[PDB]
Amino acid sequence: GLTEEQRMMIRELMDAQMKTFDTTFSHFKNFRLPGVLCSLKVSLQLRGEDGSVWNYKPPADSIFSLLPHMADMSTYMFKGIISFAKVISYFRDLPIEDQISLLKGAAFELCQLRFNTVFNAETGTWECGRLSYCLEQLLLEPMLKFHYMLKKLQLHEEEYVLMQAISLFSPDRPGVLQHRVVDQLQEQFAITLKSYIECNRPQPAHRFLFLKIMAMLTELRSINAQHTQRLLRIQDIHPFATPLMQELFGISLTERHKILHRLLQEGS
């Protein structure tokens, strides 16, 4: 039994998730594709409305071909992440600078949390509806070990959307001014998540699940730093980042993120 606010807090996040998560990627169009890292090698599949199936197999040892597509696809995911935060009441009340700082530090993490919901552990494929991404002693790349472990927990929709709230309202993000207001918000999401697990998962397989989930968020925070550095090493060599990704990567706060600033003011 949750409090009348904890129940109201989850319904707001679940409604926020339903309104902003395009699980089928139906509105994901006008993206780049390979024209006619070694652990994260993926094979792109693209199904059509008529039932046709395009399949792209990347070449072997010679790798920057799929990055333009993965940049466009991740940008579309982050646009839904922005809209997810805009409809949360606790997020819109924050200053416009903290909304940019929180979305800068939680862009990658909230994308991963949504990808794990469409990840297939048995087939190794990220079933993104229209598109699919199938992989080619391999769960050492922290990106994939995180997804396989998180998928093993078999979390609910309420638990996934609560991890997004805890990751979004991180008080120790670079540039956050209201560090105490964000920390007060983050504590309530963790309390609601801890209370939800106790009321709906009495099984022994889900023992210490809240501490496991919090440990995943800490690991995902470390993987966020690793991948951001790995992608800046490639951007320095081969420019592949989208205009919105350059603002996140850091390539006066609202003046350096004019796209993020405009998206936070439009009607959600």
Add this chain to the structure above:
Amino acid sequence: GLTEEQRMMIRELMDAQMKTFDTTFSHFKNFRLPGKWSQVRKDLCSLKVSLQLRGEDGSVWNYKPPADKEIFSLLPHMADMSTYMFKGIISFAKVISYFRDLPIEDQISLLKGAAFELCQLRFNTVFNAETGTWECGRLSYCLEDLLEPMLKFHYMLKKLQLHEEEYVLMQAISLFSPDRPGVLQHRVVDQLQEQFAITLKSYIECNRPQPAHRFLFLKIMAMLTELRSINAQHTQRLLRIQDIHPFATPLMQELFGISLTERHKILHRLLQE
């Protein structure tokens, strides 16, 4: 043991083939790709193919066709494929001396009736029987699901294991068909076809064992007869489909029939340059 004219007759067709047959399809670019109604779905089910497209880096794009507007996806591509092939078929005839000396209308009539047949003969050279795939260099076409006469023709012709000289002689016999619609020089073309047929019959005797290839010439002639029937069949199927869904290129519309040189001005223009 061929005559010096039969020897020079083959040397001209081989030079004709090597100048106009892009066996690697290196110059086939800028083609379309996948982005009375009941009478169409028949042949489409028999000729369902999966397109493969390799890249310079080694990447492989593959298009699997949608299972049973459903099969109209490969039509724009195969129209560009057929058009590119036929333009090389036109260039093949434009360098043959016996073809240039014919009237400009008889040249159009021969190319109209032998367009499909000469295109199949070149497609059989790049067909892989054990894998069932037309290996067109960067492009590949593998079918799924020998009942279709066009498929039975390719499997039977590939089993004969003909030479490059025997393939180019089949193109000469099929090109110089005197009974094509609109041909005026029935006496000249029929005598030309006999000269190529005699050379093919004499080539098999002089360059192959006698008893094992005793009826190889008659088998080849039987293939051209069966291929002549498939040319009629396939032309009717695509006229039923083109009338419903336009997929034919302007050069294909002239062949399909959609004053002789004025109704085939594109084919005429390609014969003048």
